[PDB]
């Protein structure tokens, strides 16, 4: 059996070949042990504070909300070392790998941010890192591939299937199925087989814990809602977790609507896909009517996970969290608005969450509401993309 529940309602589970079950049980046991170990907790806290730069600021955006009754704060994960929230959990998973005595790390990456975060944690902590990346992604993410290699990681292109993220996910699991005795699979989001959705949430929950302390200090009350983009689910569940039991706080997840839900070119499986079993879990996914797995489309490469974490599917099902979508054009407008009015360049992933908050404000400008958007990362990496688009249009 297991020490912790592998399911969130009907979602989740451990759908991996039998040969990998001992690796998952070992990981779960090490995680449960580490969470009770004050020494592990102190080492993790020391890396987060003195290496990654936590706590991250909570920035009030008065220029954006001028003329409305919305007060908007941005949780600044864009200021974390590496430029996105992913750094929090790769530091925790690298410490777990060492606790289990593993010396090698396997990771998958799509847009490259998780690959960079896994390579920097592995370089700092003395682990040999290999990263699988679909060959179409390797081609469009040359900068990130070079960063990984400067940090000593081996980057291995994956040409099978669609040669993108899901194919790299498969390859990582194929490798782990034969190398688990010496390697740990550092999964990049709050999805996959148990215990990963649970471990990644717990290693990202300081986002919401800090946000709660910071907003109480600055406003003397909890937010009316916290809003985060959802690619696979890690930054959002990290912001949501500490607020789940504060029933008055709305939890809003934003999936990419791409060119529009009605076009079918989107990445919004939670609200517009169908439940399936893939990547080790039962969860909503992008799939054909026959059951073949498809890609997620978005202007933002980082919202490319073709499924979603099971805890989000569960929180939706019971009505505790609400999920919406934002199109490419809405995300681009939010990106431009934050640069011009607050001097902050947001990641295009994060721009989806900001765009929904801007809609909440603009649609009901006289509604009094205290909102926090998780700014999951910085957007220097998206400057070329935005430039090319705006140029194509004029």
């Amino acid at each position: 059996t297991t020490l912790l529940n592998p399911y969130f309602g009907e979602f989740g589970g451990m759908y991996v070949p039998q040969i990998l079950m001992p690796a998952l049980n070992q990981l779960e046991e090490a995680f449960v042990s580490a969470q009770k170990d004050p020494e592990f907790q102190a080492q993790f806290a020391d890396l987060l504070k003195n290496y990654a730069g936590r706590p991250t600021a909570l920035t009030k955006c008065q220029n954006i909300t001028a003329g409305t009754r919305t007060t908007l704060y941005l949780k600044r994960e864009d200021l974390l070392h590496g430029g996105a929230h992913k750094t929090n959990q790769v530091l925790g998973q690298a410490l777990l790998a060492k606790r289990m005595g593993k010396s090698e790390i396997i990771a998958e990456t799509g847009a490259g941010q998780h690959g960079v975060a896994s390579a920097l944690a592995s370089a700092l902590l003395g682990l040999k890192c290999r990263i699988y990346m679909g060959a179409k992604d390797v081609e469009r993410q040359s900068p990130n591939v070079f960063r990984m290699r400067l940090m000593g990681a081996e980057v291995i292109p994956v040409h099978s299937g669609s040669a993108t993220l899901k194919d790299a996910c498969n390859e990582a699991l194929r490798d782990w199925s034969g190398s688990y005795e010496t390697a740990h699979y550092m999964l990049g989001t709050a999805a996959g087989p148990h215990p990963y959705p649970t471990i990644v949430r717990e290693f990202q929950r300081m986002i919401g814990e800090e946000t709660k302390a910071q907003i109480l200090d600055k406003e003397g009350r909890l937010p009316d809602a916290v809003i985060a983009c959802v690619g696979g689910g890690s930054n959002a569940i990290g912001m949501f977790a500490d607020f789940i039991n504060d029933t008055s706080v709305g939890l809003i997840g934003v999936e990419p609507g791409g060119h529009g839900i009605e076009t079918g070119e989107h990445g919004a499986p939670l609200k517009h896909g169908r439940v399936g079993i893939y990547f080790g879990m039962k969860a909503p996914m992008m799939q054909t009517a026959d059951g073949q797995i498809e890609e997620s489309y978005s202007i933002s490469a980082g919202l490319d996970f073709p499924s979603v974490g099971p805890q989000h599917a569960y929180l939706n099902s019971i009505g505790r969290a609400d999920y919406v979508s934002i199109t490419d054009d809405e995300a681009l407008e939010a990106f431009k608005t934050l640069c011009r009015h607050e001097g902050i360049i947001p990641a295009l992933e994060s721009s989806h969450a900001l765009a929904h908050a801007l809609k909440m404000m603009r649609e009901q400008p006289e509604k009094e509401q205290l909102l926090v958007v998780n700014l999951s990362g910085r957007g220097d990496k998206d400057i070329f993309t935005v430039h090319d688009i705006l140029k194509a249009r004029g």
Binding site: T1, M14, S160, G178
Partner: protein, 267 residues
């Protein structure tokens, strides 16, 4: 039906092990795949393991990843696979036919409906590669309701509790893994499997068929000598298809020679 039970009883009477080839349905096309399968049978296959093309075969090495890619290039769908399966059973009434599935294809339109379709076309067993015993309940229940044998993989890293579960839950045959990793002829399993084989017999498990990395006659004879009821070869068979795509006739001749040699080794 009891096709696996009848086969193993007949094989034991002849002091023979089973040889079971695996191919991806529809690779390189529907018509050629049907011809490949008849050649495997005529050359001596005792049973068949047949894969339905899936977008993400995460327990497979490159050889079978490419077989799935070729079948997709040919437009092969699960509905076409079931039509192929009905035809194969209509031609060969007694040979056991097992499917190699991935969970999403079984869960897609309903687990119970999937196994009911298998019964309708005459399939005998189903191995769902990414469903461990721990998640197997709805699959094995539906299998048994529709007279399909649910197959479970017994890994090298197994323990007593897992052996008792595989013995209790499986039917037809027990899939004895040669090693960790993914499918592939270029990686031979070298762990002695004598102990597992003996514990499976002790717990009255379905007869063991060894699979993964089996690509030569001496491995078939070694598996039977260790106490397994037979051996499965997939990647070695599929490599013959891959190497001879441009020559369909030579492809069938080479498959015949290979299967014949592998089956001879089981005697």
């Amino acid at each position: 039906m009891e096709r696996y039970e009848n086969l193993f009883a007949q094989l034991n009477d002849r002091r023979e092990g089973a040889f079971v080839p695996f191919v991806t349905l529809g690779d390189p096309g529907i018509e050629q795949s049907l011809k490949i399968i008849d050649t495997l049978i005529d050359a001596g296959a005792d049973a068949l393991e047949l894969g339905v093309p899936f977008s993400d075969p995460l327990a497979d090495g490159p050889t079978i990843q490419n077989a799935n890619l070729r079948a997709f290039a040919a437009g092969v769908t699960p509905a076409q696979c079931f039509e192929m399966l009905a035809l194969i059973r209509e031609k060969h009434p007694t040979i056991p036919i097992g499917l190699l599935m991935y969970a999403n294809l079984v869960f897609n339109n309903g687990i119970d409906a999937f196994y009911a379709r298998c019964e309708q076309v005459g399939v005998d067993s189903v191995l769902v590669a990414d469903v461990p015993v721990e998640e197997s309940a709805p699959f094995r229940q539906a299998a048994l309701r529709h007279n399909i044998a649910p197959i479970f993989i017994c890994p090298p890293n197994a323990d007593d509790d897992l052996l008792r579960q595989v013995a209790s839950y499986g039917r037809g045959y027990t899939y004895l893994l040669s090693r960790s990793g993914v499918t592939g002829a270029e990686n031979r399993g070298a762990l002695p499997l004598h102990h597992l084989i003996e514990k499976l017999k002790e717990y009255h498990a379905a007869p063991a068929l060894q699979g993964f990395g089996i690509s030569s006659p001496e491995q078939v004879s070694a598996a039977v000598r260790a106490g397994a009821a037979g051996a499965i070869s997939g990647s070695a068979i599929v490599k013959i298809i891959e190497k001879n795509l441009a020559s369909p006739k030579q492809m069938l001749a080479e498959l015949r020679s290979f299967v014949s040699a592998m089956k001879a080794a089981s005697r």
